[PDB]
Chain A
Amino acid sequence: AESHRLYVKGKHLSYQRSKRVNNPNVSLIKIEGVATPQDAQFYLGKRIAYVYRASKEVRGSKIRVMWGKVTRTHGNSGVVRATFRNNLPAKTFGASVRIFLYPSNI
């Protein structure tokens, strides 16, 4: 088959923040196809992986990955809070992220 993607793609909007102060420890992730928090409930707890390429080959591969989890819904437009072992660099706002279907409960 032409398509092999087994994950739902999304875009990282920005960190949880107030008008002035921001909280880098929490990130807001937009999931394609989600419109309301009720639909976003399915994605809660799903693993979140960010993939970026680095010129220097590390451990035999040039691809580096950061892992995270879906924590809770955000807003009334399907936005969902996300957390990672290491917070995103803040330079990836609007960048695509991979939301896997595991751990699945269906």
Chain B
Amino acid sequence: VEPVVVIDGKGHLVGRLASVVAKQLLNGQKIVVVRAEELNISGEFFRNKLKYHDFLRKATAFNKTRGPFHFRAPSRIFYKALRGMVSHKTARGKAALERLKVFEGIPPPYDKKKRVVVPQALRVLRLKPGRKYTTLGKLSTSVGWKYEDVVAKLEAKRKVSSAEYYAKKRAFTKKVASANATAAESDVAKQLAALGY
């Protein structure tokens, strides 16, 4: 329905978000993920942090370079989870992965475009109340990520100047509502209500 879907990873589960996005990728739908650094994983910090180290151990017994290497960026962590859910090493899998983009925060021009969320992957709607959860930001920093401060610092600048845009939009909508409200009850407006509009 949307040529390019932008998904906000904040408050989502990596496994649920990755699985949902993975199927869409195989279906030809292009998807972009933003604010990956704010993505969350179930369980308290120790379990998530401990499991990441265990995976790092089995990289390669003899030579890490002649094998896999560990990406510290939160986006790569999500990409690794999504990569395992796609038939990599194949033309269909490789082509599907090319339709996916992941960035920390909301780099432009996506900042000026609407972003959606997946209702069936939100932590609020999936995790039991009162249970502990882990955030990729702390996990990524604990494993050597050196850009958490930069992302947080410039993300506030993203948060700023957006409320101003909404503030102008909110005032503009107020004028539209007043213009629409006064125009209501007219002959055309009254007839429209009959047809449900």
Contact = CB atoms under 8 A, between A and B. Distances in A.
Contacts, number: 16
A93 B26 contact: yes
A30 B1 CA distance: 12
B92 interface: yes
B63 interface: no
A95 interface: yes
Interface residues of B, number: 7
Interface residues of A, number: 8
Contact of B26 (A32, A94, A95, A96): A94
A93 B28 contact: yes
A38 B92 CA distance: 31
Nearest to A33: B1
Interface string A1-42: 000000000010100000000000000001010000000000
Contacts of B65: none
Contacts of A13: 27
Interface string B14-46: 000000000000111100000000000000000
B1 A93 contact: no
Interface in A67-106: 93-96
Nearest 7 CB-CB pairings of A with B: A94-B28, A94-B27, A11-B28, A11-B27, A93-B92, A95-B28, A13-B27
Interface of A: 11, 13, 30, 32, 93-96
